[PDB]
Amino acid sequence: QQVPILEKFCFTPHTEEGCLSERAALQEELQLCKGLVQALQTPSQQELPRLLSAACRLAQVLAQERPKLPEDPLLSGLLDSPALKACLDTAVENMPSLKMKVVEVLAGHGHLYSRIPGLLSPHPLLQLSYTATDRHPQALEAAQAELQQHDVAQGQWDPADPAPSALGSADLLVCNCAVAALGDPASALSNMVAALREGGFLLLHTLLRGHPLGDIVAFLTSQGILSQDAWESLFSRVSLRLVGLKKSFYGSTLFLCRRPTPQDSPIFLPVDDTSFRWVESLKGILADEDSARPVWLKAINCATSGVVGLVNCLRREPGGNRLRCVLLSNLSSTSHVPEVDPGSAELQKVLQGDLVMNVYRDGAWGAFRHFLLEEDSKTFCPAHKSYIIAGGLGGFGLELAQWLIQRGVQKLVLTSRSGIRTGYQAKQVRRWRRQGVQVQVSTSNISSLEGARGLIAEAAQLGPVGGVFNLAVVLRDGLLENQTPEFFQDVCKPKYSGTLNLDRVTREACPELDYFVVFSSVSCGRGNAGQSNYGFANSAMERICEKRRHEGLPGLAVQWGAIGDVGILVEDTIVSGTLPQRMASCLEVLDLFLNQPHMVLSSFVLAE
Ligand SMILES: NC(=O)C1=CN([C@@H]2O[C@H](COP(=O)(O)OP(=O)(O)OC[C@H]3O[C@@H](n4cnc5c(N)ncnc54)[C@H](OP(=O)(O)O)[C@@H]3O)[C@@H](O)[C@H]2O)C=CC1
Numbered sequence: 001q002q003v004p005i006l007e008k009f010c011f012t013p014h015t016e017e018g019c020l021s022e023r024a025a026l027q028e029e030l031q032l033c034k035g036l037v038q039a040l041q042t043p044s045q046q047e048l049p050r051l052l053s054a055a056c057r058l059a060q061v062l063a064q065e066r067p068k069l070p071e072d073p074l075l076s077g078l079l080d081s082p083a084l085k086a087c088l089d090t091a092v093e094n095m096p097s098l099k100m101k102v103v104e105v106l107a108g109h110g111h112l113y114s115r116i117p118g119l120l121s122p123h124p125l126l127q128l129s130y131t132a133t134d135r136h137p138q139a140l141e142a143a144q145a146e147l148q149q150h151d152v153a154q155g156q157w158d159p160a161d162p163a164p165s166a167l168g169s170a171d172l173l174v175c176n177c178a179v180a181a182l183g184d185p186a187s188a189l190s191n192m193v194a195a196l197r198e199g200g201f202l203l204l205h206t207l208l209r210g211h212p213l214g215d216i217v218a219f220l221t222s223q224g225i226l227s228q229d230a231w232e233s234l235f236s237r238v239s240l241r242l243v244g245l246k247k248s249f250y251g252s253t254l255f256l257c258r259r260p261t262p263q264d265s266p267i268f269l270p271v272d273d274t275s276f277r278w279v280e281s282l283k284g285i286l287a288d289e290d291s292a293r294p295v296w297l298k299a300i301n302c303a304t305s306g307v308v309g310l311v312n313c314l315r316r317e318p319g320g321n322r323l324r325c326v327l328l329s330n331l332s333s334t335s336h337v338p339e340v341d342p343g344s345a346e347l348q349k350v351l352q353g354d355l356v357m358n359v360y361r362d363g364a365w366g367a368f369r370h371f372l373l374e375e376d377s378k379t380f381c382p383a384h385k386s387y388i389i390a391g392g393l394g395g396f397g398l399e400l401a402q403w404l405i406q407r408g409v410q411k412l413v414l415t416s417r418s419g420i421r422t423g424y425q426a427k428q429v430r431r432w433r434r435q436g437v438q439v440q441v442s443t444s445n446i447s448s449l450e451g452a453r454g455l456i457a458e459a460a461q462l463g464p465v466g467g468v469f470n471l472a473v474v475l476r477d478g479l480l481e482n483q484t485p486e487f488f489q490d491v492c493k494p495k496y497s498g499t500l501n502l503d504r505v506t507r508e509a510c511p512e513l514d515y516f517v518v519f520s521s522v523s524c525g526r527g528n529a530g531q532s533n534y535g536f537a538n539s540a541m542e543r544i545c546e547k548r549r550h551e552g553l554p555g556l557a558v559q560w561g562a563i564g565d566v567g568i569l570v571e572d573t574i575v576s577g578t579l580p581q582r583m584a585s586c587l588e589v590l591d592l593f594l595n596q597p598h599m600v601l602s603s604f605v606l607a608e
């Protein structure tokens, strides 16, 4: 009995402020801590309140309680929040392989070993080597159980010194210096940079002077607590580029920085051409194995480009290391579209960061990130409305049909270019009809506007159209070297065209539509070698659903991992470290997912 990992997939600005606003417990604790300091000058059992309360009666006291202080909910707020995961997933996404070597500085008071390995462990392919270091062996003695549980190696490193050889060519260095003292920050950071490979990341958690929490801790302990400007000056000083910034409402901060790489001349390739002629171009560019020139796919003219899913798949193929993209994707027609031509300022910023994923949406640069879903109550359907499944005679289609009938659907149109071709398809339609369900098998093809209009018309004869579900798929798997514009056309027709055509027809003629649902893939969400065209097609549908939801229309894309029992995959097999999700699991997840306000959801099952 298997437990899927359920996530939302959300546009995430590189820069976020006001983080942890909604968290009333931190809002309350801060107000209390502000009073207790206001009292010294003139959540209450938590460490920083308890320490401030002990200071009101009266150096010795805090020295005892310093090892307990990092786990104060304000001090640890950003760490136990989606901001940490966003920063980590950004590093992983920018690795040349699925091996990340991580080194924690001053782990003793840092405690990032108790979060980072666990945040990354649910990833099926990622090979993590995490080393918790500190200046004294005594520093990490209390945590020895947690280090073993999380498979964390141990090291001795005072960041005042050069790093031990062992810890060199690190991919990511992490340091929670909320409580731990770097000493001379410029020296510390300088040594931390040298320990990184070129293009390696630094993730620093700290408190900002000029913000309530830093000023409170600053006042209490009287090098130390720096302003944002000082930190950002220090990053430039040691030649780091700030590529991500997460600020809590009380001035706790995650800085995501990157050591620059000597950049060869970039190749720009527009991937907006609806004929996919750019496929042949890209093939010739990546065919040159000699070339280490980075390849920048530009989607600037089409908000529904699937470039992101494309990139995820091509990064898994030979020469994939080289690939980056720019996507302009405003949900609002009122939003400014920035100029990103070679000379421009907006592009130079993107190039300096050199991130794989550069998505511009309604004023901010960011990327789509995955976040653990919250809830993890059975749905029911209006019995008078018609329900359309494109690809309805498929593996997942026949199960989705049954599942809709169990929830009160009496009016189904199942679309298929070739109609009933198996005895199972024949048996199921015949049984449902016997059961008094109106089941139309239609060859009307959503790939064209005509077919889509025909299909809605057919549905509308049964009852007003309540739901459309795009489960249509054509596969043309192969590495890019064996792809053609025609193969891309074939894979995109049922999904991109199909979803565009349904979008437009349901807008024009389905005012009673409750459900617009497309079945995307982990192949798009995470990437799969040999499926770049499928990556793109699924990614486009997701961009359509986001747009629809922004205008208040129904829109949900579901990124399924492998499906068991029925479907393409089936026609016990661990797949890229995942189990095919059993159909009973898929269907109870879909109940959860259908009554959810998020635009793109993900479900996959991890192999143990
Ligand atoms: N199975 C899996 O492991 C996974 C599936 N998914 C997604 O889930 C969905 C269901 O896949 P699954 O049931 O496995 O696949 P199947 O191949 O079993 O069924 C898909 C059906 O789509 C039909 N189809 C293709 N193009 C069109 C079109 N233009 N109009 C109407 N019908 C069309 C095909 O029939 P015909 O040839 O007669 O047109 C086929 O029967 C797909 O969107 C897929 O991408 C995602 C992740 C994993």
Ligand SMILES: O=C(c1ccc(-c2nc3ccccc3o2)cc1)N1CCN(C(=O)C2(O)CC2)CC1
Pocket (backbone or CB within 6 Å): 122, 123, 124, 125, 475, 521, 522, 523, 526, 527, 528, 531, 534, 560, 561, 562, 568, 569, 575, 576, 578, 604
């Ligand atoms: O080979 C995989 C595969 C690839 C990668 C992963 C995976 N990578 C991850 C990274 C991080 C987190 C979770 C992750 O999961 C899981 C499975 N398939 C089969 C095909 N497939 C399809 O859709 C079809 O082509 C049949 C239609 C999708 C699944």
